[PDB]
Amino acid sequence: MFIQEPKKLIDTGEIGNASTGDILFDGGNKINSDFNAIYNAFGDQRKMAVANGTGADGQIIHATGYYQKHSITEYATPVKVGTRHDIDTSTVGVKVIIERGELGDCVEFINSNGSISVTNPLTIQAIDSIKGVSGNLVVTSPYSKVTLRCISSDNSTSVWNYSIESMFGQKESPAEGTWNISTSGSVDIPLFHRTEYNMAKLLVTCQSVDGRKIKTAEINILVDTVNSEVISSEYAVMRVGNETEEDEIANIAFSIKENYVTATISSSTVGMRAAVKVIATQKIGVAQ
Amino acid sequence: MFIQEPKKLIDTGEIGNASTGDILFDGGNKINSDFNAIYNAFGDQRKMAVANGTGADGQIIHATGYYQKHSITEYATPVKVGTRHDIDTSTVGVKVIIERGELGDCVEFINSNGSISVTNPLTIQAIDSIKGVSGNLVVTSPYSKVTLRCISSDNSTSVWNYSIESMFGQKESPAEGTWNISTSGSVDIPLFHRTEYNMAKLLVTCQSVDGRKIKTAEINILVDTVNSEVISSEYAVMRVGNETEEDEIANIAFSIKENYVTATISSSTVGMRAAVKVIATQKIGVAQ
Amino acid sequence: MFIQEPKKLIDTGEIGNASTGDILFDGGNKINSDFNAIYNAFGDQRKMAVANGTGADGQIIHATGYYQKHSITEYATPVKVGTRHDIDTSTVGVKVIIERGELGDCVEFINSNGSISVTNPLTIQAIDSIKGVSGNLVVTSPYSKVTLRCISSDNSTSVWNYSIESMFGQKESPAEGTWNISTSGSVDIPLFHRTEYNMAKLLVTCQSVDGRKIKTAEINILVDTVNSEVISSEYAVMRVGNETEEDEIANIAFSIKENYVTATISSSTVGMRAAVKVIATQKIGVAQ
């Protein structure tokens, strides 16, 4: 691997005190050291084996950043904080060790070839320990993204915590916000175009400006494109200042309006607010 | 657009072999080429039309990184791997093509002005193909973030996969971990301050140290700030080593303790562990 | 704090017009200005108090990027766009102000020491305003990541929107895609190894190639490792072109096959597609 050297700056404090030969060699090497540190942090380090990362197929600065691809032997020694790794466990699981960190230090991993599995796992050991984990963190989720962050350093108290998430997938939320139920006692909230999703899941919480009346419900909806309708299943309904155990506080209906799956929120109680949030969706794609 | 040139390094191998005129011109241009590559990867490229990205309103290095704003004509030719784009489809949908990549290569998109829609979509074509997609990827989610990653290159097998997520929204989880049910047979788990959310959704899985007794349940809770209470709706309950089809394995209750919405987990079975995870929340904000 | 100066480039347009003394001093300072701008955007700025970020414990380029740790007094003045902050509110809440931005500008925050709370909050004021927020954004979620983005600038119309998410936690999805129900009328979809999770939540939507028959359901499953089985709870079922209100359109079963929790989708209707997506999981870890 390439272990950069800290930042070096040109000592302009000299020059009319050391001739042109020494300042260009002590300056050049300094400029080549820094850039190398920058290009290897945002570029493929494997290219250093050529013209020192130069040439036509040389190193470039990836705006998206870069995740280095190292070998087993290289991971035999603790990795430096701030590095990025694209793990490959196709032939065998790989063990990565992170040097002791300080508050905020970070190391990130990805698995572009999706080799991570239970037989060929990604084992991570963060010098000292990882919260909620006894020993090493064993990652078995293919195509994942792992982020490790030091949440405590001080003296020996060098503890880390982590997050693991999928590199891919449709995770967006087509709608999230708060709307007022107009004086007319009804409000339309467009969620998404009829062609965007087959089903969605949302959370709806209606509350009076005073806070004495409140209702929340979870609703799953199915888009019936053929009949231009939307089926819904409202459950886990909870109410507080409901004057009666009958129809109450706020009603939620669905349909397609202007070609947009839409939520219609109505209420008898004047001055009602309604928070709507889509927390999940499913879209039928192409098999395989 | 600005298409950077690979990394260039100063040939200190010369100097006391080529006078000061040539090494400063061949060196300078080299230093201006690299920096330009770095500033345009982390800065607004549109500024290159001025003093070459210099001056008072010149280019700067964004720690948050930067997402270039290009024109239709510029996107007429395949984009380089590692680039970032802030799409604008307000006047019409825009088609972006990505050059053939290699394992790990990445291109990211965002939609700051939220112009992306079904009529003005973001069409992405990744040289060769995108997994689970027949043809181009058609993005219609406004204010989204799209990440494309090459999961296979080798020879022609240059396939990509993607993720799409919302740029905005409250997605945090106020609590996630595992707690022991004390010998007393009860444990309190603070979830969040009473003022942080109106409703939350959590997953609770209790299992004996031996693994013969286990229960999981999904619970939606509503915060009643006025009465300082919390309503809950527990469903999809599943149990395994339940000695009876009556009350069993573990009970989950909610309330406000020390001003924190809290989960109280109790069980008759000695040596029980309880994993609690909040997977969704809703907070009434200000309309519009 | 360190407020960088815009990009500076070496004026090769001179040299055989200004002797070696002036071009090295005007060039050097230029090279030290740029690098400093780069290292402070991707490195600990607190080190500038030493050998100007040099030496053994000098500044380095973090591939993962870096989040600066500033003081209360420093945050007394508006922060520059593109900066990153690791907030510390252990002693008291901290107020951060962001200078007026332009479309796409971004500022990101993290909370490595998890000091953020309702008593010691992170208050953010984005010059002009933040959508859906009246006044300042008050963040009380510990160990969070806050991203602010300008979604509109033009003249005075400088509005921002935000996202807030947990720095840590298991958020991955072990499976998401679309599969064809083979002519045999049944398809097996492996979700994850039996040891990866105790419970999972998934969304399943089956639709005929023509679109007249469609069903969606939400299912929570519990992994019974001891008996090598999987309990499931299917609910919120919705159907459209169901010829009868009896068993219909598609059945979903679960079990362990080849040591992988697996979903078996079957249907009488020929030519059926089935989208499966795991949207939540829970894994019992180690207490504390």
Give the count of beta carbons closer than 10 Å to the beta carbon of residue A176.
Answer: 21
Cβ proximity of A149 and A143 under 8 Å: no
Cβ proximity of B248 and A240 under 8 Å: no
Alpha-carbon distance C219 to C252, whole Å? 9
Alpha-carbon distance B35 to B60, whole Å? 11
Cβ proximity of B63 and C41 under 8 Å: yes
In Å, how far is C165's CA from the nearest CA of chain B?
4
- B169–C contact, CB cutoff 8 A: yes
Residue of B nearest to C285 (CA): B178
| A279 with B283: Cβ contact below 8 A | no
Q: Give alpha helix (H) positions in chain B.
A: 21-39
Q: Which among A140, A133, A262 is positioned nearest to A191, based on CA atoms?
A: A262
Resolution for the entry shown, Å: 2.3
C55 token code pair? 């030496």
- A189–B contact, CB cutoff 8 A: no
| C151 with B86: Cβ contact below 8 A | no
Breaks (C-N over 2.5 A) in chain C follow: none
Using the 8-state DSSP alphabet, how is residue A131 labeled?
T
- B135–A contact, CB cutoff 8 A: no
Opening angle at CA A119, ends A115 and A125, nearest 5: 85
Mutation to test the B interface, candidates A22, A36, A240, most B Cβ within 10 Å: A240
Domain A174-283: CATH superfamily, name plus number? 4-oxalocrotonate tautomerase-like (2.60.40.1680)
Residue of C nearest to A138 (CA): C196
Mutation to test the A interface, candidates B219, B224, B282, most A Cβ within 10 Å: B282
The strand pairing partners of B222, in sequence order, are B199, B231
- C42–A contact, CB cutoff 8 A: yes
- B95–A contact, CB cutoff 8 A: no
Cβ proximity of A242 and A213 under 8 Å: yes
Alpha-carbon distance C48 to B134, whole Å? 52
The CATH number of C17-51 is which of 1.20.5.960, 3.30.390.30, 3.30.70.890, 3.90.470.10? 1.20.5.960
B11-22 b/e (C-beta count within 10 Å ≥ 16 → b): ebebbeeeebee
φ/ψ (deg, to 5) at C152: -175, 130
Q: Give alpha helix (H) positions in C141-204.
A: none
The strand pairing partners of C229, in sequence order, are C224
The structural domains of chain B, with segments of one domain joined by +, span 17-51, 67-166, 174-283
Alpha-carbon distance C261 to B107, whole Å? 34
Nearest to B163 among A167, A195, A216 (CB): A167
B88-121 b/e (C-beta count within 10 Å ≥ 16 → b): bbeeebbbbebeebebbbbbbbbbbbbbbbbebb
The CATH number of A67-166 is which of 2.40.50.180, 2.60.120.640, 3.40.50.970, 3.30.470.20? 2.60.120.640
Reading phi first (left if > 0) and then psi (alpha if -120 to 50, else beta), residue B53 is in left
Give the count of beta carbons closer than 10 Å to the beta carbon of residue C263.
Answer: 26
Sign of CA dihedral C181, A141, A40, A106: positive
Kindly give, in sequence order, each residue whose CB lies less than 8 Å from that of residue A191, ignoring residues fewer than 6 positions away.
Answer: A174, A175, A200, A202, A260, A261, A262, A263, A276, A278
E strand spans, B111-158: 122-126, 129-130, 137-139, 144-152
Residue of A nearest to C277 (CA): A282
Rounded to 10 deg, the angle between the B21-39 and C21-39 helix axes is 20
What is the residue type of A54? T
CA distances from A19 to A14, B22, B110 (A): 9, 17, 51
In Å, how far is C56's CA from the nearest CA of chain A?
7
| Helix, strand, coil abundance in chain B, percent, nearest 5 | 10, 40, 50
- B21–A contact, CB cutoff 8 A: no
Alpha-carbon distance C13 to B139, whole Å? 46
| C163 with B176: Cβ contact below 8 A | no
C123-135 b/e (C-beta count within 10 Å ≥ 16 → b): bbebebbbbbbee
Strands of the sheet with A94-98, listed across from one edge = A94-98, A122-126, A137-139
CA distances from C24 to A129, B8, B203 (A): 49, 20, 64
CA distances from C25 to A56, C18, C21 (A): 32, 11, 6
Residue for token pair 């229960």: B215
Residue for token pair 């549109």: B46
- C15–B contact, CB cutoff 8 A: yes
Give chains near A: 3+ CB pairs under 8 A.
Answer: B, C
Chains A–B, number of C-beta pairs less than 8 Å apart: 205
- B279–C contact, CB cutoff 8 A: yes
Residues on chain B touching A39 (C-beta within 8 angstroms): 7, 34
